[PDB]
Write a protein that binds this ligand. Structure first.
Ligand SMILES: *CC(=O)Nc1cccc(N2CCCC2=O)c1
Ligand SMILES: *CC(=O)Nc1cccc(N2CCCC2=O)c1
Lengths: 304, 304
């Protein structure tokens, strides 16, 4: 029993983290096969970040200017190219610890683990969600850029995130491993504000299932609702519209608990309208939206 | 910026996890040097657990009855002994991935990372605290026993916890790596209830410092208090008495923020008396008590 905000084991990703230095900028790179991936802003001074022309800035950089260090051993850079907002540094040595991997571009509402690194060294691991506004709520200091987000399916790491920047509101923006930003964000130090942080309705419902499975049941009520009725209440509280797709995704948790998805929607409706009344659900005083239905099934069944 | 419930990177511990089978019971073992550590209840049937005599049960077990598997390779057991509530299985092969390690017995209020495993395979990593009632609030299914809790100081893993049992109230009890239970708990399936889950005052104050450092400041007020005055309010709300030792431990965070510990105590007092009023602090709707002052400094400074 018990339900915890749970990251993937970080070992496979720890083995891929390197230090990248260009001039006075040190951040992290991801070493897979003979390629090190890092944010292209490694080449920028903080002054550059105001209005950088990356193609022009990059012309002044040679292979020997990219200092790549795996623990205490230097890697030889034999090539470099810019792909969107990442640099791919070709090194002469394949990472012997390269796990099976994919690059995946995730959807908002999807969760992933971040291995926070500084100077190519792991500091910690925490679970995130791609927010509906395409930000993440991370923990990232200067030097943490190039830290990656990932999922693991058995032995295959799916990298979905590289950390690039902090918005003045303390939320985080980054790219997939092809270097495309999630959402409208740019690697420039400019006026970028996040849109509405809407709550991931399908994840809250998943987490309400996890609560019932783990003994927290006080919020179950005698009511049901319809998608359309629920969605009126969703709109009012800046929750994502619930779709039949979301209902279908919750089917296994419905089946396991014997609570119809729409009945759980009616519970969530009363919770939105009436609050917690100073009660908690799985040790939380608000509705948690960074567990996917897949996360709930994984944790509740003990997948490794 | 940003502050997250953050586990240690699990790689060093992943390298130590093995499967232990005795008869029909499979759980996890910790392989350090040529010793595998696992809960002594590996030798019990669920029927045994009602009133087990471990010395007597153990007499019927030989080295060849302890099936120890690291990934897909079997380890030869050349010795076995019981130390308190753990078994030490001597194997003929030193774990080549043994990190630098210590066994430490932690105090209540101290935090640690758990690597949840099933069948010697990592499922996930989350941060815990030894509760003042000597329980932890974990995520543990059948097969997760022998999962360990740890801290890392640079390159040295300090193992503090092995998971042994779930109380009927869904909270968790276990041992240090010498096999001594935290608190009054026994590896018997019996009437064991947890005492009062008191809140770790010093950790809440640490976390209020982390909030101020990361921009969440609405709860700062014009008031101060005394240890004795604060402790009246602590008593009422089942918070640990705040000691001068706790005040001294918060000194660095006080210095960094310029908020006197007793002024932060006065903030915490108003929060206890008046609630959050539907506001959040570092994305939480309750007062978080599973960050130590050390955790806050580590995360806020980017220690690796
Ligand atoms: C994105 C990131 O991590 N930025 C970064 C890397 C290295 C150094 C910095 N600094 C140091 C102080 C000024 C600054 O931006 C930032
Ligand atoms: C402590 C722990 O993990 N217990 C454990 C290990 C292996 C198998 C079990 N089971 C399976 C179903 C009944 C039972 O107790 C428990």
């Amino acid at each position: 029993s018990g339900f915890r905000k749970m990251a993937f084991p970080s070992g496979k990703v720890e083995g891929c983290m390197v230090q990248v230095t260009c001039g006075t900028t040190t951040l992290n790179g991801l070493w897979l096969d003979d390629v090190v991936y890092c944010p292209r802003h490694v080449i920028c001074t903080s002054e550059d970040m105001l209005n950088p022309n990356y193609e022009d800035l990059l012309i002044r950089k040679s292979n020997h200017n990219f200092l790549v260090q795996a623990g205490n051993v230097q890697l030889r850079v034999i090539g470099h190219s810019m792909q969107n907002c990442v640099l791919k540094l070709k090194v002469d040595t394949a990472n012997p610890k390269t796990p099976k991997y994919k690059f995946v571009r995730i959807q908002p509402g999807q969760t992933f683990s971040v291995l926070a690194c500084y100077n190519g060294s792991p500091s910690g691991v925490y679970q995130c969600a791609m927010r509906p506004n395409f930000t993440i709520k991370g923990s990232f200091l200067n030097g943490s850029c190039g830290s990656v987000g990932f999922n693991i399916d058995y032995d295959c790491v799916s990298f979905c995130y590289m950390h690039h920047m902090e918005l003045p509101t303390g939320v985080h923006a980054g790219t997939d491993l092809e270097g495309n930003f999630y959402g409208p964000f740019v690697d420039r130090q400019t006026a970028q504000a996040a849109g509405t942080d809407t709550t991931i309705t399908v994840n809250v419902l998943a987490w309400l299932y996890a609560a019932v499975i783990n003994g927290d049941r006080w919020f179950l009520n005698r009511f049901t609702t319809t998608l359309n009725d629920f969605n009126l209440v969703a709109m009012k509280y800046n929750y994502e519209p619930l779709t039949q797709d979301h209902v279908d995704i919750l089917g296994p948790l419905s089946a396991q608990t014997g609570i119809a998805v729409l009945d759980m929607c009616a519970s969530l409706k009363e919770l939105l309208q009436n609050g917690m009344n100073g009660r908690t659900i799985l040790g939380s005083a608000l509705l948690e939206d960074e567990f996917t239905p897949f996360d709930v099934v994984r944790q509740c069944s003990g997948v490794t």
